[PDB]
Structure 1
Amino acid sequence: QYSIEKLKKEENSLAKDYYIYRLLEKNKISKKDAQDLQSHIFRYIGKIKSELEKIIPLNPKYAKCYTYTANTILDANLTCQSVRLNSLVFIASLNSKDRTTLAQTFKNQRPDLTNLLLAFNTSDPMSYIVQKEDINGFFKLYNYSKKYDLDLNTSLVNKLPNHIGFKDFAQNIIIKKENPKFRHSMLEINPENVSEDSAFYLGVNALTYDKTELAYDFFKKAAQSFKSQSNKDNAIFWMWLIKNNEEDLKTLSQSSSLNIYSLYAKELTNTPFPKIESLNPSKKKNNFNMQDPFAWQKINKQIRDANASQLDVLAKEFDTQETLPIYAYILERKNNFKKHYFIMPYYDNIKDYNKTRQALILAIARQESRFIPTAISVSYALGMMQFMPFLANHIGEKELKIPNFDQDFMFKPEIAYYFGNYHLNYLESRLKSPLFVAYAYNGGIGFTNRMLARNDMFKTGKFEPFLSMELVPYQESRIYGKKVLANYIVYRHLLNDSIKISDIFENLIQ
């Protein structure tokens, strides 16, 4: 470990945060050591904040305004009332006499506040706001209570997409399968009124009610408006699944984006496999330390700051086997993510696993870390396979009994791949398909089991398994699974062990 004073020398980074956090969680930082530690934390969110505030606890314009309570709010001036009435919890806490008075007071200057004040006099504030078609109020109330749910007319639902909250509202209720009356109402949104992710989710919604022509119209709108080729491909795939137009399949097979949809279309049209870059430096190693987390943070900052000529210079400093992940990382930026980099670094460590397992390990590592051995996430997951300290210590200390085990052993590629394999043996025994294994690797076996036990997920159906892949209940896991699955297909191909993509999808249907 590093002493608190040595850490304070280091530049501020997620690595420095992580080591500060290691000392805090062991109670190794004294009260004076802890004093200026606020300024030595790169990202002062989550576990590290909570832990520092056990030692060091934390706008004068409005200090006066928080002296007032529900009982004294009418004594406050207009500015203080305004500030306090930003909270719906606070509005709900008032009595109806005072809400009625405040409603009259704010009628001209804050009419949206008036609507909410009056809404909270009724037993269903959402019904009141819906009657008004007060869109700002609608989203405030949804954020206040996710339980409100009622039928919304065509006029109202077609106004909802003109609010920045709509996208995540729509996504959340669709993938969580909540607010049935809201979901059903959104069938009357005109595709003309939505674009990108909103249009896409409304497509998925329409598919869950078996409105296939409506779904096509939403997916087509998404395909025309998405800015990223990867999302375009996902929308075009749905246009093809619904109407079977050959030109959509062909456009999809010709995509510059390497993803499961474009790969699947290439298979279906006998289009060749995409070109994968082949990187194999002659030099085995240099003086750069790939196990030093601070050195990576420093060189990452320099790479992220660099122009074309500077990236070319940096590439030549890292053209070695041992530094291949940094080299590939530099080159991925130098070609603006246009070429396809699927490296297989520290391969001697996995060569004795069978090729299917190698492909899965590589697929997960590429997604988790791009193979950077000292990768540290915002939750302090570590190394190429991004093990959380809890799991790393459980495997290293309890189950495997490794002498002198520290969780920083995760920065060693030999350990990362070994623990990766170990954890994959456990997941794959229960879950079978590499897609389901990916979901559990990212989101835990618990949520993955609860999901697969549902009678509406990954069962036989017209648009399965593709519909279920859009309804994974966590946005992060949905995306993760698709990316890892694409990576898995590519690594199977690179290992002269190609898999038929159609086979993979057929196996998802339980």
Structure 2
Amino acid sequence: QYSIEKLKKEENSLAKDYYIYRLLEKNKISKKDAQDLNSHIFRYIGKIKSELEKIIPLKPYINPKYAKCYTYTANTILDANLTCQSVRLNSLVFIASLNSKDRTTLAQTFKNQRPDLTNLLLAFNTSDPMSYIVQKEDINGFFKLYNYSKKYDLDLNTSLVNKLPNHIGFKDFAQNIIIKKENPKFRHSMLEINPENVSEDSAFYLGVNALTYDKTELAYDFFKKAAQSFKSQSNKDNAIFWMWLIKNNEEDLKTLSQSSSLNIYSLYAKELTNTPFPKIESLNPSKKKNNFNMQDPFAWQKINKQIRDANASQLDVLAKEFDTQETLPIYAYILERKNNFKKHYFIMPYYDNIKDYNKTRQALILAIARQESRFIPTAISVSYALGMMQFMPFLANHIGEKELKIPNFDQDFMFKPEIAYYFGNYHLNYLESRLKSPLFVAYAYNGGIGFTNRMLARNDMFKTGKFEPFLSMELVPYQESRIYGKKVLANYIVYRHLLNDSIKISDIFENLI
């Protein structure tokens, strides 16, 4: 381990952050050491920020221009100047705290210059501020109220619902209420959004919404708009898949089978149309090694930043330097970027550690590692998940110390490929014994077995139905896990194919119901 003095000489990065966090959790950062430390932190969010703030609370920020505005309370705000009154009324909780006579007075003060404030003040003088704001068709007010409280729910007419998509809050609003199955009046109302007024993710979610109300024609129209507007081919393919499932136009299935993106939808379409499996690149560098230390986390952070900021030309230089057996994961990572994500790279590094597992297990391990880390041994996530299999420290220590009793175990052993694959096998055994399906195992790997069990206990998830199991896959309630499962399933299919242990993705889908 490294002293705070030595860390401070490294460039700011997630690896430096991780090692500062390890000092904080072992109580090795003094109040004096902590003085300058926020300037040494690459991403000052979450656990590292809350640990540091136990040592030095952070005061700010109040823009000094408005400091005086924050000396007033709900009881004294009528004594404040007009600028101070309007600043404090940015807060809906502040508005809710006012007495209703003061809301009446302030609404009159601001009716000319700030009718938005007037609307919210008079809204909070009623028993349902949302109904008042909806009657005014005040769109900014609507989103402010929603952000204040998710509990408001009302029917919204055609005119009002068609205005909502123009506001930056709409995409997260629509996603949250559709996935969480909340706010049913809002959800039903969003059936009347004209597809011409939405695009991309929002259009897609509105398609999903329409399916849940069995409005399949409206669903098709939303999904078609999504397919036409999505920036990523993978997302476009997901929308085309729905267009096909709903209306069964054989041109849509044909377009999906010919996609340049390898994903579950394009793989499925290929299978349904007797189209050959996509071409997988074969990387076999002849050079054995270079000078690069694959076990130095700081060196990875530095080379990653260079690779990500490399122009078309500097990528070619790096490709050559890292075209060795020892740096195969870095080589594939460079090629993936250098080829503009058009070629399919499915490497199997450190294969000696898994070659004695059965091939189905190999493929699941490789599928997870590909998505988690792209096989970078010293990978570190924003939540300080570690190594190729991206173990959280807590689980790493549970397995390495309590279960396996590895002598002198430290969570940094997760950066060793032999350890990553061994622990990954261990945990995947636990999960698969309970969940069976590789998709369910992927959800549980990323999101936990508790979330996965609760999802599978519901009457409306992964049961029989017209559009199952695809619909359920769109309604997995955590976005990171929803995405993750689809990517890991595609990888699994590919690696099973590469290992001469092919399975039809249609058999995976049947086993989800």
Separation in structure 2 between the aligned mates of residue 167 and residue 40 of structure 1, nearest angstrom? 35
How far apart, in 2, do the equivalents of 1:11 and 1:236 lie? 45
- 1:298-317 aligned within 5 A: 298-317=302-321
| Displacement after TM superposition at 1:472 (Å) | 0.5
SS in 2 for 1:64: helix
Distance across 1 between alignment mates of 2:57 and 2:352: 49
Instruction: Indicate the larger mover: 328-337 or 276-285.
Output: 276-285
- Deviation, 1:284, is 2.7
Name the stretch that deviates more: 271-280 or 298-307: 298-307
CA distance in 2, matches of 1:359, 1:426: 17
Whole-angstrom CA distance in 1 between matches of 2:301 and 2:165: 40
Question: How far apart are 1:343 and its partner, in Å?
Answer: 0.8
Q: Separation in 1 of the partners of 2:308 and 2:404?
A: 38
Measured in 2, the distance between the counterparts of 1:130 and 1:305 equals 47
Deviations 1:358-411 (A, max 9, x none): 111111111111110101011100001111111101111111111000000000
Q: How many residue pairs align between the two structures?
A: 509
Distance in 2 separating the partners of 1:214 and 1:53: 50
Q: What is the aligned counterpart of 2:217 among 213, 220, 224?
A: 213
Query: 278-287 vs 343-352, which deviates more?
Result: 278-287
Which of 266, 274, 277 is 1:273 aligned to?
277
Q: Distance in 2 between the 1:186 and 1:34 partners?
A: 50
The residue correspondences of 1:19-418 to structure 2 (distance < 5 A) are: 19-58=19-58, 59-418=63-422
Q: Is the 8 A contact 1:315 1:330 kept in 2?
A: yes
SS of the aligned residue for 1:503 comes to helix
**Distance in 2, Cα, partners of 1:176 & 1:249:** 30
Cα deviation digits, residues 314-373 of structure 1 (max 9, x gap) = 122211222111111111111111111111111111111111111111111111111101
3-state SS in 2 of match to 1:63 = helix
Q: Is the Cα contact below 8 Å between 1:322 and 1:346 reproduced in 2?
A: no
- TM-score, normalised by the number of residues in structure 1: 0.99
Q: Give secondary structure in 2 for the equivalent of 1:508.
A: coil
For residue 422 of structure 1, report the CA deviation from its aligned partner. Answer: 0.6
Q: Identify the range of structure 1 (459-468 vs 149-158) with the bigger mean alpha-carbon deviation.
A: 149-158
Q: Is the 8 A contact 1:373 1:412 kept in 2?
A: yes
Q: Deviations over 1:423-462 (max 9, x none)?
A: 1001111111000111111111111110000010000000
What are the Cα deviations for residues 60-111 of structure 1, in whole angstroms up to 9, with x where unaligned?
1011111010101111111111111111111111111111111111112111
Aligned mates of 1:55, 1:395 — CA distance in 2: 31
The percent identity for this pair of structures is 100
Using the TM superposition, name which of 145-154 and 283-292 deviates more.
Answer: 283-292
The superposition leaves residues 273-317 of structure 1 with CA deviations (integer Å, 9 ceiling, x where unpaired) of 111111111233222111110011111122122223322221222
What stretches of structure 1 of length at least 5 have no aligned partner? none
Which stretch shifts more, 412-421 or 297-306? 297-306
Question: In the aligned structure 2, how far is the partner of 1:389 from the partner of 1:128?
Answer: 50
TM-score between the two structures when normalised by the length of structure 2: 0.98
Distance 1:283 1:495 in 2: 25
Q: What is the distance in 2 between the residues matched to 1:459 and 1:160? A: 33
Specify whether residues 265 and 18 from structure 1 end up closer, same or farther in structure 2 by C-alpha distance, changes over 3 A only.
same
8 Å contact 1:119–1:128 — kept in the other structure? Answer: yes
Mapped to 1, the partners of 2:131 and 2:221 lie a distance apart of 30
- Cα deviation code 1:31-77 (max 9, x no counterpart): 22111111111111111111111222221101111101010111111
- Runs of 4 or more above 6 Å deviation: none
Give the CA deviation at 1:191: 1.4
What is the root-mean-square deviation in Å for CA atoms of aligned residues? 0.9
Equivalent-residue separation in structure 2 for 1:75 and 1:447 (angstroms): 51
State whether residues 220 and 239 of structure 1, in contact with CA within 8 Å, keep that contact through their aligned partners in structure 2: yes
Distance, in Å, in 2 between the alignment partners of 1:471 and 1:88 is 31
Higher mean displacement: 253-262 or 284-293 = 284-293
Deviation at 1:245, TM superposition (A): 0.8
